[PDB]
Design an enzyme around this catalytic site. Structure first.
Site, PDB file in Angstrom:
ATOM      1  N   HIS A  40     -50.149 -55.960  31.247  1.00 48.33           N
ATOM      2  CA  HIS A  40     -49.363 -55.397  32.340  1.00 48.33           C
ATOM      3  C   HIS A  40     -50.097 -55.388  33.680  1.00 48.33           C
ATOM      4  CE1 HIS A  40     -51.466 -51.541  31.340  1.00 48.33           C
ATOM      5  NE2 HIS A  40     -51.242 -51.252  32.610  1.00 48.33           N
ATOM      6  N   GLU A  52     -70.032 -54.540  40.362  1.00 45.75           N
ATOM      7  CA  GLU A  52     -69.513 -53.542  41.291  1.00 45.75           C
ATOM      8  C   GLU A  52     -69.880 -52.089  40.966  1.00 45.75           C
ATOM      9  OE1 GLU A  52     -66.915 -55.252  44.446  1.00 45.75           O
ATOM     10  OE2 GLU A  52     -68.352 -53.651  44.002  1.00 45.75           O
ATOM     11  N   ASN A  54     -69.686 -49.140  44.083  1.00 41.98           N
ATOM     12  CA  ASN A  54     -68.810 -48.626  45.138  1.00 41.98           C
ATOM     13  C   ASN A  54     -67.904 -49.807  45.509  1.00 41.98           C
ATOM     14  OD1 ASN A  54     -69.229 -46.822  48.237  1.00 41.98           O
ATOM     15  ND2 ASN A  54     -67.625 -48.290  47.713  1.00 41.98           N
ATOM     16  N   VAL A  57     -67.775 -50.963  49.558  1.00 34.11           N
ATOM     17  CA  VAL A  57     -68.933 -51.383  50.353  1.00 34.11           C
ATOM     18  C   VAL A  57     -69.743 -52.466  49.673  1.00 34.11           C
ATOM     19  CG1 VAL A  57     -71.185 -50.685  51.228  1.00 34.11           C
ATOM     20  CG2 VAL A  57     -69.247 -49.089  51.346  1.00 34.11           C
ATOM     21  N   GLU A  62     -72.847 -57.663  43.857  1.00 37.17           N
ATOM     22  CA  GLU A  62     -71.504 -58.158  43.615  1.00 37.17           C
ATOM     23  C   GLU A  62     -71.435 -59.672  43.464  1.00 37.17           C
ATOM     24  OE1 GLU A  62     -72.603 -56.577  46.172  1.00 37.17           O
ATOM     25  OE2 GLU A  62     -71.443 -54.817  46.698  1.00 37.17           O
ATOM     26  N   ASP A  84     -50.538 -55.445  24.561  1.00 33.95           N
ATOM     27  CA  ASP A  84     -50.913 -55.340  25.968  1.00 33.95           C
ATOM     28  C   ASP A  84     -52.346 -55.828  26.155  1.00 33.95           C
ATOM     29  OD1 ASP A  84     -50.824 -54.799  28.651  1.00 33.95           O
ATOM     30  OD2 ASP A  84     -51.119 -52.642  28.453  1.00 33.95           O
ATOM     31  N   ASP A 171     -59.351 -37.723  30.612  1.00 32.04           N
ATOM     32  CA  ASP A 171     -58.497 -38.842  30.238  1.00 32.04           C
ATOM     33  C   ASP A 171     -58.660 -40.006  31.220  1.00 32.04           C
ATOM     34  OD1 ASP A 171     -54.870 -39.010  29.563  1.00 32.04           O
ATOM     35  OD2 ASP A 171     -56.516 -40.346  29.019  1.00 32.04           O
ATOM     36  N   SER A 172     -58.122 -41.164  30.844  1.00 31.50           N
ATOM     37  CA  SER A 172     -58.140 -42.334  31.709  1.00 31.50           C
ATOM     38  C   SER A 172     -56.847 -42.165  32.505  1.00 31.50           C
ATOM     39  CB  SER A 172     -58.112 -43.630  30.886  1.00 31.50           C
ATOM     40  OG  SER A 172     -56.983 -43.676  30.029  1.00 31.50           O
ATOM     41  N   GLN A 174     -54.039 -44.107  35.836  1.00 34.17           N
ATOM     42  CA  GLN A 174     -53.626 -45.334  36.521  1.00 34.17           C
ATOM     43  C   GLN A 174     -54.791 -45.845  37.369  1.00 34.17           C
ATOM     44  OE1 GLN A 174     -50.481 -44.589  39.464  1.00 34.17           O
ATOM     45  NE2 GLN A 174     -51.516 -42.656  39.995  1.00 34.17           N
ATOM     46  N   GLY A 175     -55.047 -47.148  37.302  1.00 30.92           N
ATOM     47  CA  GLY A 175     -56.161 -47.711  38.043  1.00 30.92           C
ATOM     48  C   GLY A 175     -57.262 -48.061  37.055  1.00 30.92           C
ATOM     49  N   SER A 177     -56.323 -48.921  33.959  1.00 32.28           N
ATOM     50  CA  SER A 177     -55.615 -49.904  33.143  1.00 32.28           C
ATOM     51  C   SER A 177     -56.361 -51.230  33.052  1.00 32.28           C
ATOM     52  CB  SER A 177     -54.216 -50.146  33.718  1.00 32.28           C
ATOM     53  OG  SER A 177     -53.480 -48.939  33.780  1.00 32.28           O
ATOM     54  N   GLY A 178     -56.463 -51.760  31.837  1.00 30.98           N
ATOM     55  CA  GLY A 178     -57.159 -53.018  31.633  1.00 30.98           C
ATOM     56  C   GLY A 178     -58.647 -52.849  31.378  1.00 30.98           C
TER      57      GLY A 178
HETATM   58  C1  LIG Z   1     -42.323 -48.316  29.971  1.00 33.84           C
HETATM   59  S1  LIG Z   1     -41.879 -46.747  29.212  1.00 33.84           S
HETATM   60  O1  LIG Z   1     -42.317 -45.637  30.002  1.00 33.84           O
HETATM   61  O2  LIG Z   1     -40.492 -46.771  28.846  1.00 33.84           O
HETATM   62  C2  LIG Z   1     -42.836 -46.814  27.701  1.00 33.84           C
HETATM   63  C3  LIG Z   1     -42.062 -47.266  26.533  1.00 33.84           C
HETATM   64  C4  LIG Z   1     -42.718 -47.472  25.254  1.00 33.84           C
HETATM   65  C5  LIG Z   1     -44.156 -47.244  25.204  1.00 33.84           C
HETATM   66  C6  LIG Z   1     -44.938 -46.788  26.352  1.00 33.84           C
HETATM   67  C7  LIG Z   1     -44.279 -46.537  27.642  1.00 33.84           C
HETATM   68  C8  LIG Z   1     -45.074 -45.985  28.811  1.00 33.84           C
HETATM   69  C9  LIG Z   1     -45.112 -44.541  29.057  1.00 33.84           C
HETATM   70  C10 LIG Z   1     -45.805 -43.946  30.180  1.00 33.84           C
HETATM   71  C11 LIG Z   1     -46.489 -44.835  31.099  1.00 33.84           C
HETATM   72  N1  LIG Z   1     -47.207 -44.270  32.140  1.00 33.84           N
HETATM   73  C12 LIG Z   1     -48.563 -44.363  32.261  1.00 33.84           C
HETATM   74  O3  LIG Z   1     -49.222 -44.967  31.427  1.00 33.84           O
HETATM   75  C13 LIG Z   1     -49.237 -43.765  33.351  1.00 33.84           C
HETATM   76  C14 LIG Z   1     -48.608 -43.029  34.388  1.00 33.84           C
HETATM   77  C15 LIG Z   1     -49.656 -42.608  35.256  1.00 33.84           C
HETATM   78  C16 LIG Z   1     -49.498 -41.702  36.478  1.00 33.84           C
HETATM   79  F1  LIG Z   1     -48.519 -42.135  37.220  1.00 33.84           F
HETATM   80  F2  LIG Z   1     -50.609 -41.687  37.206  1.00 33.84           F
HETATM   81  F3  LIG Z   1     -49.232 -40.491  36.054  1.00 33.84           F
HETATM   82  N2  LIG Z   1     -50.809 -43.070  34.769  1.00 33.84           N
HETATM   83  N3  LIG Z   1     -50.587 -43.764  33.610  1.00 33.84           N
HETATM   84  C17 LIG Z   1     -51.641 -44.202  32.820  1.00 33.84           C
HETATM   85  C18 LIG Z   1     -52.375 -45.450  33.077  1.00 33.84           C
HETATM   86  C19 LIG Z   1     -53.512 -45.877  32.251  1.00 33.84           C
HETATM   87  C20 LIG Z   1     -53.934 -45.043  31.127  1.00 33.84           C
HETATM   88  C21 LIG Z   1     -53.186 -43.804  30.867  1.00 33.84           C
HETATM   89  C22 LIG Z   1     -53.594 -42.927  29.702  1.00 33.84           C
HETATM   90  N4  LIG Z   1     -53.922 -41.548  30.104  1.00 33.84           N
HETATM   91  C23 LIG Z   1     -52.054 -43.376  31.688  1.00 33.84           C
HETATM   92  C24 LIG Z   1     -46.430 -46.278  30.876  1.00 33.84           C
HETATM   93  F4  LIG Z   1     -47.037 -47.072  31.755  1.00 33.84           F
HETATM   94  C25 LIG Z   1     -45.742 -46.876  29.750  1.00 33.84           C
HETATM   95 CA   LIG Z   2     -69.477 -53.088  46.148  1.00 38.35          CA
END
Ligand SMILES: CS(=O)(=O)c1ccccc1-c1ccc(NC(=O)c2cc(C(F)(F)F)nn2-c2cccc(CN)c2)c(F)c1
Ligand SMILES: [Ca+2]
Length: 223
Positions: A40, A52, A54, A57, A62, A84, A171-172, A174-175, A177-178
């Protein structure tokens, strides 16, 4: 990363930053020319940034390299987030050293309780958004499948696992991811998704890398 700590300059040598005029995802260097990330995270115009700390900067270690090709798993489903995982080939091999190194693929899956290191430049707030300049770290355990599925009824496939704290606070996000989830020197997971971040009874869900070792090897061998 929410509730984590500052890794320390170049202490996670395999951590990469996917850039397109800004940091949008993390990744892991598995050899001199290949990076593993989340499906994704895919998009065009991707520049891989290695060594990397910072991300705003230029500090001295890098290495910016363009992706020559991005391979999203053919069975990736954006509606379920199943499979994924994505492979990115670098235009030229990276210069490996003490600050830029690859992480080993697992030979076997990890078990519940196993302690892992998760890192990234993702959001650090459970409520609201604020990104750091330097790399953040978090030590977290892999949860049992029962706990994982109890937290996310009907959304957990055999290619996912939960890791983190049910009490919330760490927890991990957004950002991230991957990014990597390393356990005992092996890349066991890829930051994929979760319901919010650092929320109670809503731990992070990760791509189970051990189920893709053969696919990864056969794919890079063919490209
Ligand atoms: C497509 S579905 O929803 O129907 C869906 C359908 C089926 C399976 C899974 C999902 C699904 C649910 C929530 C999410 N949302 C996130 O994963 C997210 C939101 C945020 C923030 F907006 F910031 F709140 N951060 N964030 C996130 C990113 C990486 C890791 C982690 C870990 N703690 C969380 C997402 F993408 C996919
Ligand atoms: Ca740097």
């Amino acid at each position: 990363i929410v509730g984590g700590y500052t890794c320390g300059a170049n202490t996670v040598p395999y951590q990469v930053s996917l850039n397109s005029g800004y940091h949008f995802c993390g990744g892991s260097l598995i050899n001199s020319q290949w990076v593993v990330s989340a499906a994704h995270c895919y998009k065009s115009g991707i520049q891989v940034r290695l060594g990397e700390d910072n991300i705003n900067v230029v500090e001295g270690n890098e290495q910016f390299i363009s992706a020559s090709k991005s391979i999203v798993h053919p069975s990736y489903n954006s509606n379920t987030l199943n499979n994924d995982i994505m492979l990115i080939k670098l235009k030229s091999a990276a210069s490996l050293n003490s600050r830029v190194a690859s992480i080993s693929l697992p030979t076997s899956c990890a078990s519940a309780g196993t302690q892992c290191l998760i890192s990234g430049w993702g959001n650090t707030k459970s409520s609201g958004t604020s990104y750091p300049d330097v790399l953040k770290c978090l030590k977290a355990p892999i949860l049992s499948d029962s706990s994982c599925k109890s937290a996310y009824p009907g959304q957990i496939t055999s290619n996912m696992f939960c890791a983190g704290y049910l009490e919330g606070g760490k927890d991990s996000c957004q950002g991230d991811s991957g990014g990597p989830v390393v356990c005992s020197g092996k890349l066991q997971g890829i930051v994929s998704w979760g319901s919010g971040c650092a929320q109670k009874n809503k731990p992070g869900v990760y791509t189970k890398v051990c189920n893709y070792v053969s696919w990864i090897k056969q794919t890079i061998a063919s490209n």
